Design a protein that fits this description.
This is part of a larger assembly, with one copy of chain A (about 120 residues), three copies of chain B, three copies of chain C (about 150 residues) and one copy of chain D (about 110 residues). In chain B, about 10% of the residues lie in helices and about 35% in strands. Chain B is built from four helices and 30 strands. Chain C has one domain. Classes of the chains: A mainly beta (about 120), B mainly beta (about 450), C mainly alpha (about 150), D mainly beta (about 110). Chains in contact: A-B, A-D, B-C, B-D, B-F, B-G, B-H, C-E, C-F, E-F, E-G. Chains C, E, F: It is found in: Virion membrane; Host cell membrane; Host endosome membrane.
Chain lengths: ~120, ~450, ~150, ~110, ~150, ~150, ~55, ~40
């Protein structure tokens, strides 16, 4: 099981930032994917999660008008797929390390994360 | 210990689970005169002559609709037929040129503002030293603004082909039939949940007629449950799997595309034609679908009553609309009278259960990626006149969000998922087995040597 | 044809032994093998030529039904049963393969249950049946017989 | 939202000594508490799946305890390798929330 | 081979019954089935691969000849005639199917004429032949016989 | 299966006659004819459909093995040997075809050597075997027999 | 100013210069299980009960 | 930074290539080995 994230990004305030997490080695569908933001001066904050089979988004109620999650699958190759994130209206308040992770098997209705990526970071 | 000898029997009624290739067949009646129907050409073998069904007394067999290779085969063959019928069409490579576009403002309602673009461009001609200035209307969802300059969306990744104007992708019913040496077993129990030891089994020559209708969220024109609404899933407590809900009564939905629409053809080359959308006759308004309100209440009451059997009879069940970053994961996609619709179902999945009509606004597209490919794209020619479809909603694809709060509630939303879930809703009753006629057993006879 | 194709499947071995022609008749004759033998052209055929992939899938299905049929017939021939749906041999029952009396298996078991009981002795039994026939031919080539 | 509070903000101890982190919920969360170990330059490591039940790959130095509102992370023979930040995660009501975190310092 | 393939077609049933191997030998061996079995490569083969439609038409013809042959052999096996070109059965003649004496049909009719006289009783007769064989096997599984 | 497929090739005709099932079992069962009969899909199959030339070559090989098998079985049937690996006939040996005593050929020659000695009399012998069977059937249709 | 005739409706291919469409005689042959019957009467008009086959 | 044995072995070629949108052209370049090109009429 491996989660591979894209590199660091810098953006002009008000611009959107898009980051991504490529997942492999387990069936991509099943096992919800969660996003968590780390702010060195505040701690961890949950942003939302995506249902990789259905293509459904669930968000933390701070970001409904700002954060969009998407997924890409190919029924051909069940062991591979990606999750993308788009965050709009980026401000200095959003300087953080953005992490990708996967829920512990048996906990799709919850969100402990067993596997983690690297952290973007953004600005 | 008796003094017995081996006796060999041939023609013994024994079988093993097996994977194979089914050959497909159709009812050569009204469908025989369709001529250009894709399904009527492929599933050519005539069937359903008052077909046989044989009850097997005392046979109990294990079924598993989630591991049923018949669905995977149906999926693969549908894709192959679509590629084969598009392969010999025009290939509209010459259209990915800069387009000069303005808004259509000619008697448009408020809900259509910015929906249509009037685009002119320099197209190739049949004689290769000339160019022509032509124009066509496009839907907003088919173009990309670049740098009034636009391009078609599918320029970065693929050529766009054009469906051939005479090919009809109408989902007439087809039947799957076993090859010699194989048999299809059918599970007849009413209230069968898709898995396990089905006690009432019969053999068939072929499956019932199945219409290969392709849609998301709401399953259209399938079979109905025999007695009660059925809820089936691979694992009901795992909010990652989809829930397939089969209604025991249809909900009628009336879909239309208003706007009289005209069509014109343009030569792009020597016998190579492109179909353009011409000016709309009459006014311009949105496509939409009508669902009876009382009916889409009574049938949710039935779905909820059945969901409570798995989630608790003191649990609050609420429905909510789809949420995601795409069109293909939030709308009800279907093909109607040849055109592709993407309808908004948030007007249906909006209620809480604690123990006139609904109008669904709808958008349409002409450039379809189809299935899940990145390259490969199709342009659907416009259809003249107006379009009206009357369809039966026979089932739902639902997902749960996960748990919620200590108030004990569950939230269900229209789901997405692979196209295979549409076929699993019809083929759940069938299994394919290989017949193995030899066997041996003890008897009192001995070969008499002479 | 196909009027009770697996009708005896849930019946006992004894009763099921009386329907053996029912299953035998359906091994070489699927729908496509009937359409292929019409006096009139089937008409469909052009489809399977224009699109050669479908033509190949159909032939593979037809060839396989024939190969499976012939392999079963070859085994019956090797074991000394040319024709016949029921034939006696000289191989004794081991009472290890299955240890039940005749009154238990012919009256209480179905063929499916039997098949699931002795499936891992199938190759041993087939091997013995072949050896038995070879021994019989060796004895036939002796004009003093037995 | 359900707020998690961790205490003490810091620990101060030597390798070979034991350590523990307390965490309290503002609302009942049953057993839906998980624990993470954080270091600079690394994504959080999951130590505990729920309440007392430990994750895969974690050594016997760690275990958890508690329920409802009162939870604890228990560390036995603390190694120099364990001088990390620790976080308490609430996973009962949505959104998933985290406490402020605690830190294990060297004397 | 093929030196008088339908030579007896205009002859009487009696005389024609003496040439049965002549027609039997030509059911599995057309020209293409001889070319396909040369020790040398046939050479032509590349044509049927370069142009797959012709390759498919040839295979369909070959597969069909085999399927038709095997179906006739299966019926003879079911009716209790494994091998033999002429076999006797226990099904009585109904004298409704055709009502002529032996001295009329064996000496005055050709097989083509006979075939056109009883063609709509073919399935009845085949059904009876199968029932007869099943009854015979039921009697064989009785060690006191008749 | 294939545990001594041509093991008797260098042995004498007498000894080699005791291994006849060994070669018979390998005429209808090559590797591809085993893969084609798996309960699971073989997986490979998509390759032979995507590239139809390979699909055709495989079918031609499978069809030919069947046609060759059936032709040999048809000859045995015509000659009056339905089944059996060894059968006696009524055709006398000419002593022109080969002029050796039994103690010389069964003990000193291999089958390959024998085949290279009488290969140009093969068709004469086959013709006589067919005539013999026809004469036998003519005698069978006489209720006074011999 | 001229154009080739086949511009409005189709592409025009070119016969390959080495391909020879010379009508050498061919024979039609029946597949196994089938036979071709020939009518030998002289002055046969194409239909009906041909007595010499 | 070519050694003596590589003098003239590699050619740096620029050209006008077609584009994904059929009304544009782009200037691109690629290195080629001497053995892959023909001098005509730089
Ligand atoms: C169909 O799908 C469902 C999923 O929907 C599958 O169920 C899942 O099955 C896996 C096992 O394969 C379970 O994993 C194990 O979980 C226990 C913890 O369980 C306790 O806490 C749960 C906490 O849940 C909270 O959050 C939810 C969601 O919001 C709330 O609803 C809850 O109320 C809580 O707030 C709780 O849910 C559990 O109760 C449920 O399950 C029990 C049965 O287990 C029922 O009786 C209950 O009524 C109720 O339904 C329960 O209270 C962990 O402790 C396990 O970890 C140990 O075992 C691992 C094995 O690999 C090991 O790796 C770990 O390290 C750990 O090992 C420890 O124990 C070993 C014992 O042998 C020791 O040897 C070892 O040293 C060490 O001490 C494990 O993670 C999922 O919980 C379960 N999911 C759900 C939602 O139920 C189901 O299997 C599928 N069915 C089929 C046929 O496929
Ligand atoms: C769930 O199940 C329902 C029920 O089956 C299904 O609804 C039906 O969909 C089909 C396909 O869209 C509809 O069929 C079309 O109907 C129109 C309207 O015709 C009416 O009037 C004529 C008399 O003039 C009556 O005979 C007829 O019954 C209707 O009352 C026809 O115009 C359509 O024909 C054209 O398109 C066909 C495409 O297959 C062509 O084959 C045909 O030749 C016609 O094309 C030609 O003429 C066109 C017009 O000039 C021209 O543009 C073309 O280029 C070409 O030259 C067609 O018969 C049917 O009426 C619907 N039934 C109901 C009750 O509404 C749902 O679609 C299905 N749901 C899903 C999701 O699959
Ligand atoms: C999309 O844009 C095209 C133009 O690119 C529109 O077509 C143009 O419509 C105008 C009228 O609004 C035509 O001008 C008039 O022509 C008549 C003769 O027919 C003349 O008598 C008038 O005085 C005036 O000049 C113009 O010729 C026509 N152009 C073309 C190429 O057809 C089209 O209507 C627009 N469609 C939509 C839905 O907006
Ligand atoms: C079709 O091509 C012509 C040129 O052949 C385009 O007209 C020129 O456009 C440029 C700007 O790109 C102007 O600077 C020229 O003055 C225009 N020339 C003339 C004669 O008008 C024309 O715009 C193209 N048409 C479309 C619809 O793209
Ligand atoms: C379909 O119904 C069967 C029962 O008829 C379910 O199988 C049983 O499930 C219970 C747990 O609820 C187990 O304790 C039993 O041992 C299971 N019985 C058998 C024979 O497997 C089955 O899970 C249901 N399927 C679905 C998808 O809900
Ligand atoms: C869906 O229902 C609406 C009514 O809510 C239908 O619209 C009416 O159509 C009639 C006939 O043309 C007009 O007289 C009314 O004024 C319209 N009402 C409104 C509010 O616009 C609509 O036609 C139905 N759609 C379908 C596909 O049947
Ligand atoms: C869908 O369209 C049908 C017409 O095809 C509507 O059914 C008609 O309803 C009126 C009452 O408003 C009756 O008088 C007619 O007799 C009905 N016609 C038929 C053929 O049944 C139906 O109500 C529409 N559905 C929705 C949701 O609007
Ligand atoms: C699902 O339903 C919600 C309403 O419950 C929709 O929320 C609205 O979204 C639009 C933008 O698309 C905003 O301008 C509105 O202000 C939102 N409404 C509220 C009350 O906040 C949501 O868009 C729907 N989702 C989909 C895919 O249709
Ligand atoms: C799907 O349909 C719903 C219902 O019509 C849309 O939600 C409304 O959007 C309008 C703006 O056009 C707002 O003024 C309303 O307040 C919204 N309704 C509610 C309950 O919030 C929704 O925007 C449509 N989805 C998409 C993607 O367009
Ligand atoms: C979902 O249902 C709610 C009601 O439960 C709808 O909101 C009401 O809309 C009417 C107008 O039709 C207002 O008069 C009420 O005051 C609203 N009530 C509340 C609580 O907001 C809501 O529009 C529906 N959503 C969609 C997409 O149709
Ligand atoms: C929607 O469902 C109804 C009910 O099954 C369909 O109407 C029946 O169709 C069958 C033939 O399949 C007839 O034997 C019944 O008599 C019909 N019942 C009634 C009340 O008319 C209806 O055709 C379905 N609609 C669509 C578009 O498929
Ligand atoms: C299915 O099982 C039942 C019960 O064992 C079989 O019933 C027997 O039927 C015969 C013939 O009518 C009677 O003589 C027996 O007395 C019945 N058995 C009992 C216990 O009453 C039934 O025949 C079986 N089905 C099949 C196809 O064999
Ligand atoms: C074609 O019909 C004629 C006339 O019936 C047959 O002639 C008979 O030939 C045999 C053998 O030479 C003679 O013994 C008979 O006396 C002839 N019949 C008459 C009436 O003279 C001729 O044999 C038939 N052709 C074939 C192939 O059987
Ligand atoms: C190959 O040739 C040798 C020599 O002729 C054969 O050897 C004979 O083997 C049998 C069995 O062991 C002995 O009884 C004979 O006495 C041996 N012959 C001699 C001359 O010593 C050998 O069997 C042949 N190989 C095969 C497979 O048959
Ligand atoms: C790409 O095409 C341009 C023209 O569109 C070429 O530039 C011209 O080259 C001719 C000689 O052939 C000169 O006389 C012109 O003055 C040049 N025009 C400009 C604007 O520079 C260009 O050289 C081509 N590029 C390549 C790499 O072949
Ligand atoms: C055309 O669409 C744009 C949005 O892309 C909008 O800003 C502009 O006002 C529209 N013009 C007209 C006439 O509707
Ligand atoms: C690819 O698409 C993007 C928009 O998503 C566009 O900006 C870019 O120019 C396109 N690439 C090319 C080569 O045109
Ligand atoms: C749908 O059912 C609920 C049941 O609680 C009821 O309150 C609601 O009024 C019903 N809606 C309609 C349109 O009848
Ligand atoms: C052999 O068959 C018996 C059937 O009763 C089964 O119990 C046993 O496990 C099988 N042996 C193996 C190695 O699978
Ligand atoms: C049955 O065959 C006889 C042959 O003499 C024919 O006259 C009769 O018309 C046939 N019956 C039917 C229904 O065709
Ligand atoms: C016939 O076979 C013998 C084998 O000994 C050989 O010598 C002879 O040359 C063959 N005849 C012909 C014409 O080849
Ligand atoms: C480039 O190659 C040519 C030979 O084709 C040679 O004469 C010339 O000197 C070379 N130029 C350089 C800078 O090496």
């Amino acid at each position: 099981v491996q989660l591979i994230q894209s590199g660091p990004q810098f953006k002009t305030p008000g611009a959107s930032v898009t980051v991504s997490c490529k997942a492999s080695g387990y069936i991509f569908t099943d096992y919800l994917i969660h996003w968590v933001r780390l702010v060195p001066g505040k701690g961890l904050e949950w942003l939302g999660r995506i249902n990789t089979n259905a293509g459904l988004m669930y968000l933390s109620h701070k970001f409904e008008g700002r954060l969009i999650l998407r997924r890409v699958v190919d029924w051909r190759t069940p062991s591979l797929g990606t999750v993308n994130m788009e965050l709009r209206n980026v401000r200095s308040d959003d300087s953080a390390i953005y992490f990708c992770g996967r829920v512990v098997d048996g906990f799709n209705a919850a969100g402990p994360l067993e596997f983690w990526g690297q952290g973007s970071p953004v600005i | 210990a008796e003094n017995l000898w081996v006796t060999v029997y041939y023609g013994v009624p024994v079988w093993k689970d097996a994977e194979t290739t089914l050959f497909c067949a159709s009812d050569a009646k009204a469908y025989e005169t369709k001529k250009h129907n894709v399904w009527a050409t492929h599933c050519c073998v005539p069937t359903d002559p008052n077909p046989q069904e044989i009850h097997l007394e005392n046979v109990t067999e294990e079924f598993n609709m989630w591991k049923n290779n018949m669905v995977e085969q149906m999926h693969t063959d549908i894709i192959s037929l679509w590629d084969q019928s598009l392969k010999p069409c025009v290939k509209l490579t010459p259209l990915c040129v800069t387009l000069q576009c303005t808004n259509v403002t000619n008697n448009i309602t408020d809900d259509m503002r910015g929906e249509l673009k009037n685009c002119s461009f320099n197209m190739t001609t049949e004689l290769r030293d000339k160019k022509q200035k032509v124009y066509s209307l496009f839907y907003r969802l088919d173009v990309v603004q670049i740098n009034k300059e636009y391009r078609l969306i599918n320029c970065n990744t693929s050529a766009i082909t054009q469906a051939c104007p005479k090919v009809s992708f109408e989902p007439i019913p087809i039947h799957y039939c076993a090859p010699a040496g194989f048999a299809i077993l059918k599970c007849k129990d009413k209230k069968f949940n898709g898995t396990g030891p089905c006690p009432s089994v019969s053999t068939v020559q072929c499956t019932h007629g199945i219409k290969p209708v392709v849609s998301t969220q709401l399953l259209l024109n399938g079979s109905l449950a025999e007695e009660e609404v059925m809820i089936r899933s691979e694992n009901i407590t795992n909010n990652a799997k989809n829930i397939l809900v089969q209604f025991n009564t249809p909900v009628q939905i009336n879909c239309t595309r208003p706007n009289n629409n005209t069509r014109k053809s343009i030569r792009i080359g020597p016998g190579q034609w492109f179909y353009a959308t011409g000016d709309i006759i009459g006014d311009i308004r949105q496509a939409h679908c009508n669902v009876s309100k009382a009916t889409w209440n009574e049938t949710l009451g039935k779905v909820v009553k059945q969901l409570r059997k798995h989630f608790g009879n003191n649990t609050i069940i609420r429905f909510a609309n789809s949420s995601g970053g795409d069109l293909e994961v939030t709308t009800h996609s279907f093909n109607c009278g040849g055109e592709f619709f993407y309808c908004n179902t948030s007007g249906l999945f909006n209620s809480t259960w604690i123990s006139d009509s609904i109008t669904l606004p709808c958008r349409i597209k002409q450039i379809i990626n189809m299935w899940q490919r990145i390259g490969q794209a199709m342009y659907a020619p416009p259809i003249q006149g107006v379009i009206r479809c009357v369809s039966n909603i026979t089932g739902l694809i639902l997902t749960r969000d996960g748990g919620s709060t200590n108030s004990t509630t569950e939230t269900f939303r229209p789901g997405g998922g692979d196209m295979r879930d549409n076929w699993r809703s019809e083929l759940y009753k069938y299994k394919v087995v290989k017949i193995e006629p030899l066997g041996v057993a003890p008897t009192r006879c001995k070969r008499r040597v002479v | 044809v196909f009027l009770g194709f697996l009708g005896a499947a849930g019946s006992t071995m004894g009763a099921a032994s009386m329907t053996l022609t029912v299953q035998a008749r359906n091994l070489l004759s699927g729908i496509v093998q009937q359409q292929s033998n019409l006096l009139r052209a089937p008409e469909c055929q052009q489809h399977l030529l224009k699109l050669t992939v479908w033509g190949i899938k159909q032939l593979q299905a037809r060839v396989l039904a024939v190969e499976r049929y012939l392999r079963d017939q070859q085994l019956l021939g090797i074991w000394g049963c040319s024709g016949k749906l029921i034939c006696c041999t000289n191989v004794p029952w081991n009472s290890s393969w299955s240890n039940r009396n005749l009154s238990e298996i012919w009256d209480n078991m179905t063929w499916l249950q039997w098949d699931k009981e002795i499936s891992n002795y199938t190759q041993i039994i087939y091997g013995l049946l072949e050896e038995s026939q070879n021994q019989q031919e060796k004895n036939e080539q002796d004009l003093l017989a037995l | 939202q359900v707020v998690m509070t961790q205490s003490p903000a810091t620990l101060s101890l030597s390798p070979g000594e034991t350590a523990a982190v307390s965490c309290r919920a503002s609302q009942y969360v049953d057993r839906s508490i998980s624990w993470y170990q954080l270091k600079t330059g690394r994504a959080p490591r999951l130590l505990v799946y729920a309440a007392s039940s430990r994750s895969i790959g974690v050594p016997d130095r760690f275990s958890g305890s508690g329920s409802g509102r009162d939870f604890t992370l228990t560390i036995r023979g603390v190694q120099s390798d364990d001088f990390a930040l620790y976080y308490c995660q609430q996973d009962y009501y949505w959104p998933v929330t985290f406490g402020q975190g605690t830190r294990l310092d060297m004397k």
